[model samples]
Target chain A: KFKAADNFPDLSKHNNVMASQLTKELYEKYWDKVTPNGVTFDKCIQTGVDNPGNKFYGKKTGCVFGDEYSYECYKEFFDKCIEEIHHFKPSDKHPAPDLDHNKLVGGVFEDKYVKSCRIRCGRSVKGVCLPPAMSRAERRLVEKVVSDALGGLKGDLAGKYYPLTTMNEKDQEQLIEDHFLFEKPTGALLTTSGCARDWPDGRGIWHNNEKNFLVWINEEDHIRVISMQKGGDLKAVFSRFARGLLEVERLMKECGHGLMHNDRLGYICTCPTNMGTVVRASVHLRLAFLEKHPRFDEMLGKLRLGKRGTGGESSLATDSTYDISNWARLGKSERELVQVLVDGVNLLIACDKKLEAGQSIDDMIPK
Target chain B: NRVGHSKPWESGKFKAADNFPDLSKHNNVMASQLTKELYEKYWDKVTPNGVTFDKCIQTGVDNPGNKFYGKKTGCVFGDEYSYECYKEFFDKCIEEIHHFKPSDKHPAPDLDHNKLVGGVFEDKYVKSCRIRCGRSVKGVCLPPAMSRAERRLVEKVVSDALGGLKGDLAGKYYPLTTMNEKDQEQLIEDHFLFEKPTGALLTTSGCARDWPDGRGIWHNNEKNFLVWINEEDHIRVISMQKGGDLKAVFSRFARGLLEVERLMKECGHGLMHNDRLGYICTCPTNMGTVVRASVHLRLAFLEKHPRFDEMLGKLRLGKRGTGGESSLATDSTYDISNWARLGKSERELVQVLVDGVNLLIACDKKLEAGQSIDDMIPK
Candidate 1:
């Protein structure tokens, strides 16, 4: 039939939601057309298509939906793609923004086990394309507008901006050591999707002198506002982060630009999984004994929490300190997600104390 | 600045990235200026909305040795804004690719069918005839960087235009996103549907992104008058039917395009054009006249002639298989159409197609008669 059939790539072997939904007929019908952002079906599902054995995991182009309406355009594919990959149900809706950390009941951890606390959330501008589809000028404009607004910060949030373009190596290293900077996105997905087109340009970081309150401009999302401090002080960290975020939003709106958001996908970020309240409230805990438990990770899953190494996702907790944070980005409010992390990590610390004391902790394990 | 994996050169030297075009040997504005130093120099350069130099030439950089790259038009323009932001680079590239000189200006489109006469087919050699051209809505992003809203806007504009047609030109729009399965399958079987843009050129050019979300086709009841929304261009208007009836096809094609143009203008949109480039398309090669008038002919004997392609070139025609460019012909069937689009009007290109096909049919008859037709060959 159609001449496109002679050239279309084999889709039978792809293990992504797109592969399952994209029939040959469907592919033939819509293969050459691109979305307004110039995103193609291939670009959207390429990571999944390329990795046939694995299900669509959005390691690249997270969720692969380029523009705001892309989800609406390919409703058939995205309906399933979002459901299966994001584990987000159509019936499920994100709760309203609850930035008042005072609503958060408990997040205090033992001084010895818990070493540090941090909470960060990403936000994109309302009237701009996402990073993968943003033009370089748009990227720069976002940086300019966002950086200008950060100048309005006062008190604990007042900070200097360190543009990746002009920052010295020593300062860059210091920022990286403090975990205050984001590495430029590398590898296949972002590269192929045009996300990393003009790197370093229009990309930078802003943090207070204490480096506890910081904002990353033009990184993965349009902005990643963060608040961090040594020791387990969830209330303080969340209070600073939430207050700073609200101030930034206020300044942004005053500048005639508001953060991208919606009720279904609150505070939209570039990644699909990161949609909703991407309030990554995390803490470093010395889980030397509890981590050895066979069902430690299972306990985390049951509590709706996640664990990563101190350095990054690809890293391991070699130093016995696990970077634990809330797992669910959607279907919950900001305060709720943080409370879950606080409750989960406190339980984990109790288990660690039991294990260290040689107490039988079989009942504490998640079934 | 952070360079992605697409960049082959690490330091000052160059190395080719796998599956990426080799820019080392490329002789164009992009190749010449895409050095590490230049990449950094223009790294911050962006249009008002953030169109950067890298975005303008990423296609060329990714596909360095592609045939489309040239000294004048280094690579494809990423979007419509590129022409204004990267004027120096685009001017040269457009000049060379379109064969549009700096001093030259494209003539206003001449869709007069009377000017495209003398395309009568005898001996029943012509299996089918078709004429098509691409058009873009002015002041909108082209396919590469167009947003979903812009694409939907284009579809609405074209679909509304098609709906207003009366008489034989009347048609219904079929969106790929929502068209019925039976109509889609039938259209595919009848070869009335265009295939996905999975080719290297299209994929690398970013034209194949998003697939069918904002794309669809519209055709009359007779299926001869058709318009494609959001294919290679914002819209591709086509007029085609069985047998070699150039007059019929040309008249319908001209009237249909003008009607759509008029309807589109009334909606506050206009076809993108300029003094130098007759029409703007996603691809450089499709610029200028932006029209292709072709016929599928069974030239079994003459097609095998060693100089067949040469003769077609001499006549200012390009030949492809019935399936389209780069496809093999079936049963000695070949699609021959006007080759040079620039420096000519649509009517002028149609005339070339008429004369060329007429001469080709004559030569085919002579060859079938076992006669030496060397005299018919151009010197």
Candidate 2:
């Protein structure tokens, strides 16, 4: 029996191209093939195949490969899916990280609309199984290695790691209440994907004294580097993030753990949607009037921005405050993503002012 | 081979087919300079599936000049395989026609019923709201290339599925061959039925072949939920009612579609969908989401603005005559719909219509108050 393949999919009934095209013949062809991490063809497609009606699964390819090795072992299937899903061609190569903040545009906006600004990205360590396939020992090793890297961080990037199992209850609650910590993964897809197998054992959060710089250890990815601050100061947040990420990466390499990245895919992560750049620079914005604008979401799309409830992806926006961020996770550089967020926030603030003045904000909408 | 024309000819000004390899339609990326260049380079080649450029473009060739002449792409894929076998041509067309670049990927389809937030359009300016999506059943040729038998098979399979719908979605399939003229005319008059396919677009494209051999309409008892079989796409699932109760319309539409899709799956069939193109259809424009959520609204002050059309374009909204696509808004009631179908989700599309009308109403308020809306005009 495969990891999550209890129900053999009736390929015809599947809606996504990957699941629908996985004919019984192709299934038979690759059924026995296994990745070095022991991921099988059935394991790679289990989520999409099992939940045929799932609308959000495998948005790009419809196939949820278990680990990084899944891309290599099931080359034919995964390659075709990746090409179709991400539009990433074999000849295409993701350029090196460009973190020069001088290239950033629209770095500041009126604090009237922007509540807070945060920039974050995920990084996976080379030679270690990603979250989905990491053993309990391997997961603990990652925690130790990353924690050691944090110990070397000085200045604003310095932080203390609090393992979920050992942290004081009061401190944990405070961190969570302050929105500096991440809770355990409980989503159906996460639990079913084997990413949450050894729950809370090797997971924790690390935050500097200022609470502006933070890192999520062993969450969706191996480590998520974050830099945040209050108000609409995107320049400060992005500069801090860029410095902290490079330092963490350099320290990790000193510990004999290099990053899991290639010129083609850039930063490798558990989710295919976050292949390159992997930066999700965001700001919590108060746009009550703009939210009521009919072209609000469309306007966001033109600006290359995405929205979520201030609470997170699943929650709804309260008090007209929404979590706005750069939507293009891949294809662009980290600086470009942050720049887009900055520019988008500036425009949103301008629109808010126009609305407050009882003037039409239509002309501000991008064509 | 013809080189690029100095400019695209105006409609009805030149014969497109006679001027083979020369564009007589609008110069979109697919039909404009790129098309002229690609057509010249690949006109004599054939795909691995045996689809020739001529076979792929018989519609544009047979009926030379229509709004969407399919000349830019120079190919209308016979079936799903053609998209793969002739990846070069189709890929370029998809990028150009859908405005989807080669590096861009279409977001996955999300028909999350709970995402829809309607009931925001009950106002004096708003009238009725309707949300419709087309889904082509798998394992059948698209309408543009289907034979009579294949077309009839689509009807049989879909009708059987429609028969199984329960509750508000329960409906009866009325085959065009069996429906009486009086009832049919009444349905057409009531705007519940699709008029007969006319013009070279449908005839040359093979959608109007064999007349009504496989065409039909299915409507539930309330007639709020309906399905158009063998019209343009395989099925056009629609939820509409008088008034701006978009919530009720979309909720019913979502539920009806879920039930119908379930029944279709039980029959060992599924929607012809993909990662890049959410829902495939006979026409390229309708692919990816394939959703059209519209409302009838009376924006007297705003609609008359010189920048009205420009404003709608910027808002990603489209305005058509209330009666039909070809009709005029004689009663001052315009059919306003969401314009971006390829990249947006179904729920988002509905939200666009709801919010667009609200914005229009807001503008109308200022205009009626004798205020300046010059700031609203996009440069």
Candidate 3:
């Protein structure tokens, strides 16, 4: 079914042509020539927020200001909001790690030292907060305390270490190329300041602060970890580098302007049910007995659960979020929407019934 | 040996009393002495032997005793018995006279003299006489020495007899001058003889003429003989030089004339050599004759005679008046009707003459036929 606007009659009483006609003939004459079909919201939008009489403003304020106000401010604010959302860092309750091992390995150590070390040392170790009530200063103190305690002894002595300074330059460059700055232009080192409002000064500001701290505290730690990992040999180093690289990739996807960057972010959002619930929900349920039990068919049949004669079962749930009677109608009517939900519920029931018939869940969970 | 001479008055004394009695044993010498006696003797023998009186006159009176006798005698003397006895003696004498000198003073007689005296009757008289007369008379008057007026008369007489006759006229007088000049020329030319403008001669005219006249004739002189020309234009000549038998000589002059005539009649003149009408004549196959000679016997005969018309008519028609006509005559058969005056033997004789002439003609005619005559003939 169509959305509400496509199915219902237009209720607004606005007459763009009449409105222009009532103005001075000068305004009417200019309006007819410049605006075929009498100017739309897209034209007003491109004119920038300086024009206060644009459709968006009219919709927002319930009044038509004159065109003297710039419409460009609204677009600027929207771009800033996108950058902040893409690069958002958690508060003290969910503080990110100060040290990114990838950055440290790439920045401070020579490539040879990093590659020669046997331990997997180049990774980011995030600090987990105890609770949201903790202050930022308290959070920082806790991180320092945890780091000091960990640094006191090498646990189990399985991994090797090397000072960051000992790594060769080529290995250092490769670490940066492959890890933190995974893409071009705004890599972990080269940052956008004006283009990204969240990092107005630049992403490099955060990188520099962390780099100073790493130089002071872990003079040999970067090289030691890289050398010990022996070019990503240590499990811990691989985990840390992998986690840091994933975070940076997520950031790039949400903030990239090109179609390819947007599609990538959309792909992440649709992966699981919680994120995919906004657009489309799809599930496949297979009904089968877990064991060779005679009662399986009978029990599933009692619950009105069985394979469709044709084979294969699928269920879909789509959001109906628009206004109007037929606003959110996906295919035809609300009934079809409800039927999709029911089909999904039935699939779940069938799964349970199959489990009950085979006594597989009961046997496995012995409680 | 010297022998005694006998007196003229002695009867047996000539034989016994003669001092040169051995002369009798020398027949040549005896022949010389017996010349006068032989003339008288042969004259008596021939008179009764049926020798023509004209012949006797010709030998004894006209031309003294000719070469047949040992003496020159216009007349014989002595009684008939004595003459008869002497004739016998002279015959033997003359037979033995080979050693005696041949008469240097004697000359060959003209055709008329030879015809009358020795050619016709001499051999008959000599053989028939018991003595075998060696001095038979062989001469007669010289073809009668016809005066122009008399010759005209003879010509008239012959023309009246033979004029317009179809074929050969045997023993008929034919004038020599009456024939057309061309025919007369053809006859003389065909015979390889010199033509005469007048007078007549004895000749065989056709098959009829040949049958009656022994294919030949003695001339008015009764000495020189003439023979018929054959269809092939061969002339039989009684060769006085070769003892009077017909001698054959292939004369191309005669054959060529006939060939020309045949070509003209059968095909016309101006025919090419390759054409059927082109003249071709007999050439000697053996005996050295390799080319043709042009001769015409009948034309020669006509040219030699005064009674040309009479002779020509008699040649065209026989004596019977039913003989074949000339080739050009309206009533003549092309092959059979034309009078062929020459006998077979005479024709053969002429063939011999033709062969001889062909040898000479070949020297030029061969080159003429070969396209090389221009180099040889007088330019």
Candidate 4:
């Protein structure tokens, strides 16, 4: 009943990602062999953020183009997820998205006490949909094409390319350990999606000379551009990634390639969370007073900001600073999304100041 | 193509149909540089929320500009962003509040806003238009008491909002993070970074907490208009350029200030405000329109006549070493700006700097018996 091409994502190798507990019955149905939207089980659960194992029978999982919106997809599994879509539009005075910049005046906030701030997003080239669905040769070719073009970047953008499939085991492990490498896919959902078949065959890593700007090739998405730097010069960091994205897009056009996207949804990314502008700008902000406030988490969420540890989620707050970023990316422009983070940080700061001054800010966050 | 508005220069304040494109009576106005499309494109179309532009400016066209554009004061004027936005959290202050009302002595001080006419400009002594104005945002406090964590968040939102201002915009901000010690040192050396955190002016007020932490400098590419955050004031914005070009510097700062304020509201952020105090700042001397517009002067002739400091204080002038502190003058580099930030209106403050600097310049010139070189070599 098993096909060689429909290989389950091999869980044998893993350095960072924990193996998913999704059973065969729950995943092997529609995704067992046949791929919808050419998306396989491995592609589905490659990243920890996407994996949802068996929990409750009645719960649902939203699978794109596979009866996610219209019908139920996770019928064989439990643990449901839901989403709401709004028909929002840009305003006249709303600033345009600039790859070169918008306010690059390097204005970081007081939360500069934190060590670093990073802005990253997932994007795939047009010619070859997601990595998994492409043939091994096609994937490898795409890597060469993109990496070759990226290598041609000038000034601070130029850097060396490291093809994961071509790298030795020791080197790969070291890269992964340093958090500079992408983790392997480890679940039925992801493996079923076709991400599991190639191992490191079609993958690679491209980063700037200082490792400040990095790209994760063939990891869920074709290219995940990353912009990071010490302290909270959010704009400067964002500008780095934006320029890289534009640079890649321009080179791809010459090769008759384009980014995977459609009108209905802005940028068509692998995950729904990163569907639009795909920007996830975050600052390692230390809101100690607010952290103690009862509504800290809720307030952050309400303001369209998400909170996690600087040490990657599970790690504890080293000094009470949580890495916070934009929760909603798709519906807003790049600058607008960045503004939300700024405003959110400001709100926390205002409240923090008030609290320290002995002011009862319980009513500040608003109902 | 005057947009069918009234003839400018033909009319004065509150003219709904004014066409004074290059010229104006007061401080605030939609940027003439902001092309119609750009305004519709880059501006926060939903400003002041539900209020119409004409109505908002109904108090008098200059009404908004007077508070916004007239002076570089860190306090809000008549427009109720500060007053109304944080109305719920007003009370509990130092039991002292001051609404910045231009006294009868200087009724329409800013009416000529940047006419740049101070009798004493016998030249030489006064140099450059490095004028600064501080305005407190509504619903926020000074940076002093704010901790490392709190200050960062507050400054981030404010700066992030400033990020939305783009292209030929004066208020665009860049952080100090990407700028290492070399960049910071360079800005100071070039007289751009403006003042280090030292001496009583700041430390006594506890204003240097997160010192360089979340702090950043913002300016136009021309290096003329600049803004400072979490240093001595919640927002110590400036309007500067080559000496004698007063109008140009003042005008740019006005636009930058409004642009910054609009972005603030667009992001739902407010400045720290008080009913009577107008805007809140760490230094009480900067209570009202905290506008400190000053110029660099060649004080060789007037160096320690014992009468120099006392002479300038009479005109309500305050002096600081070019490094943003006093008693630490290097190479005779004295930063001479307005002494009174608390009491005066926008134009009054600007006039104070112009008149005071000229007055000092004239006297310094008069007392000169020629060279500052071999005369007093610390002997």
All DockQ scores: 0.03, 0.00, 0.00, 0.01
Lowest lDDT 10-residue stretch of candidate 3 chain B: B128-137
Question: Candidate 4: what's its TM-score on chain B?
Answer: 0.55
Tell me the tens digit of each residue's lDDT in model 1 across A298-322: 8899998888888877778877998
Candidate RMSDs in Å, in order, are: 13.4, 27.4, 73.0, 29.3
Off by over 4 Å in 1: A1-193, A196-367, B1-53, B65-74, B77-85, B194-213, B323-329
Docking class of 4: incorrect
Task: Please provide TM-scores, in order, for all candidate models, with all chains considered together.
Answer: 0.55, 0.46, 0.15, 0.39
lDDT of 1 by residue, B151-177 (tens): 777888888888888878887888886
Report the lDDT tens digits of candidate 4 across residue range A1-367: 3342233333332221223334445555634333323333433443422233334332223233211221123322212211332223322122334454665443377544445788888776654445434444455656877897898788888887888856778867867765788756754344434344344656788878777888878777677888887876777777777788888888888877777664544565544445667788888887767777887777887898888788774567667788888887655677677778877777887887787787888777855
* Candidate 3 global TM-score: 0.15
lDDT values, one for every candidate: 0.72, 0.71, 0.23, 0.55
DockQ of model 3, rounded to 2 decimals: 0.00
lDDT of 2 at A315: 79
Top lDDT model: 1
- Rank order (by DockQ, best first): 1, 4, 2, 3
Per-residue lDDT value at A112 in model 3: 22
lDDT of 4 by residue, B113-207 (tens): 45546423423544566657666555433443343444566677768766876766634465764566876775776566754465422432235
Q: What share of the true interface contacts does each candidate keep?
A: 0.00, 0.00, 0.00, 0.00
